[PDB]
Design a binder for these strands. Structure first.
Lengths: 294, 294
DNA sequence: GGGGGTAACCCCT
DNA sequence: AGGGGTTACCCCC
């Protein structure tokens, strides 16, 4: 890895949640895939660096599947750093060996397009390392992949693949490094697949007993995949949950839940705990609101 | 007017709750019912010929909401319907009433509207010397199409019943004056969804006071909705919920402050009604009860 | 038949 | 740029 030569490292991953993939018709300039630690105070973008080598290199980025045999995604990166359809590319000058990708879009392919767009991509890979032409059998078989790749491909999750290149024999940058794959990126427009947000809730306080019903208004969530985690910041690390049925999650924008019992029963003074929305599979949370026992 | 044979609508179509279908959804999702239809007792739009007995054939077709009845981009579909989107039932000499019991409304896409429009307009304008007329005036036919498309509501249609008697010279081309029904809103157009209240966090509050209530509702438009409190007639009293558009959360929840009752310091608590109402429409939801306490 | 939800698109500020 | 909402489509039971 780190002493089999020069290698890439992702200095700043893409933000896994909250980024919207755009269909070609929505427009060309709706805003860039940011870094995992971006915020409106200070913006960050996915960043990578070449280690163990200095001097000109070219880093390309392209979308691969969520699946770990990393395969090219039907979706395309779009933006300033990209070509006609040719993928996004940044140049590392020798002093600073790190590349920011600060204007990266994800063009959403329609299902009605997916196969055509994918054959059009597999061809290119066939005519990449391997020789110049495709026999009809060569092509019937390429179309195979397309069909059985469309059955199993998640159009709401992508991974960036950074492919770093160095000047080969002729000075043409076609001698590559091992490619480095980022953490998965969810489409904020896939239902309930954005980041958790607590808009407002109707009670801020209840009895230490628990069982008090609270109306929580949130951004779109999945009835089946959401929870309401109460907790304390301390060495005790106490946690409890909201009590609700799926029918209690109203049209993916509200949760009617009954508060959990506090870890003690006879508090002398009123105690503030935190609650947060949490994703069941994933573990990402919303910003916590305070709740006071007694 | 009893100055000839004439059509009368015995049973109008239901104004609200009927869904218009796009061609791709399917062909057989259920019939436009009568204004007084109900579960178990179904009615369908019905019309009758008066001042005449014997054979007629009645067509129905979709006209604009706009009072100069014009042909709508949408077409009637289903059991009784020819390719051309005009439906016909034949009225036998004994019973002079026609039920249309299996009527669909095929929703044209906006991308289809022009072609669908030029095509219904040509067919309309094709009687006299068709071959050389058509070409001469299709540029200035297309003028209507453009200026008809920007001003046509695809969420409201009217049935137009056109009755035709047997002209024994040829047959069945003899026209009666056409009768236009009351309007039919697409239940899937946001502006026409049936208003429902799911749940509410308080069911009582202080008479001549406004408390904050969380209301969970079906889809509403922030700018077109209200919360009407009302009684079984005492002084035909009504008051409203207090909330700004910001208070209508993702079209499925309303955070509002209850209005004061008309009569401060009531002897004991009084139950009033509350309901969602569209501002312009005048359609409302089934009312929930609210109790004013002193 | 009759729904409920997801996918693609539009357009405001 | 970044949204908020409508339009078109899918598919369950």
């Amino acid at each position: 890895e780190t002493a089999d030569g020069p290698y890439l490292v992702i200095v700043e991953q893409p933000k896994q949640r909250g980024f919207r993939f755009r269909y070609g018709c929505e427009g060309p300039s709706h805003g860039g895939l940011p870094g995992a630690s971006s915020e409106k105070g200070r913006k960050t973008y996915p960043t990578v660096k070449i280690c163990n080598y200095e001097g000109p290199a070219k880093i390309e980025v392209d979308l691969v599947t969520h699946s770990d045999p990393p395969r090219a995604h039907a979706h395309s990166l779009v933006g300033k750093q990209c070509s006609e359809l040719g993928i996004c590319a940044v140049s590392v000058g020798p002093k600073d060996m790190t590349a920011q990708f600060n204007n990266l879009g994800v063009l959403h392919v329609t299902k009605k397009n997916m196969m055509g767009t994918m054959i059009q991509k597999l061809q290119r890979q066939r005519l990449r390392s391997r020789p110049q032409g495709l026999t009809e059998a060569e092509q019937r078989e390429l179309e195979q992949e397309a069909k059985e790749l469309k059955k199993v491909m998640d159009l709401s999750i992508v991974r960036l693949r950074f492919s770093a290149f160095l000047r080969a024999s002729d000075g043409s940058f076609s001698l590559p490094l091992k490619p480095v794959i980022s953490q998965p990126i969810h489409d904020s427009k896939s239902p309930g697949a954005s980041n958790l947000k607590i808009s407002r809730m109707d009670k801020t306080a209840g009895s230490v007993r628990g069982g008090d019903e609270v109306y929580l208004l949130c951004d779109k969530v999945q009835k089946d995949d959401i929870e309401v985690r109460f907790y304390e910041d301390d060495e005790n690390g106490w946690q409890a949950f909201g009590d609700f049925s799926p029918t209690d999650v109203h049209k993916q924008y509200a949760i009617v839940f009954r508060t959990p019992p506090y870890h003690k029963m006879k508090i002398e003074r009123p105690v503030t705990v935190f609650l947060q929305l949490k994703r069941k599979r994933g573990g990402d949370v919303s910003d916590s609101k305070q709740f006071t026992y007694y």
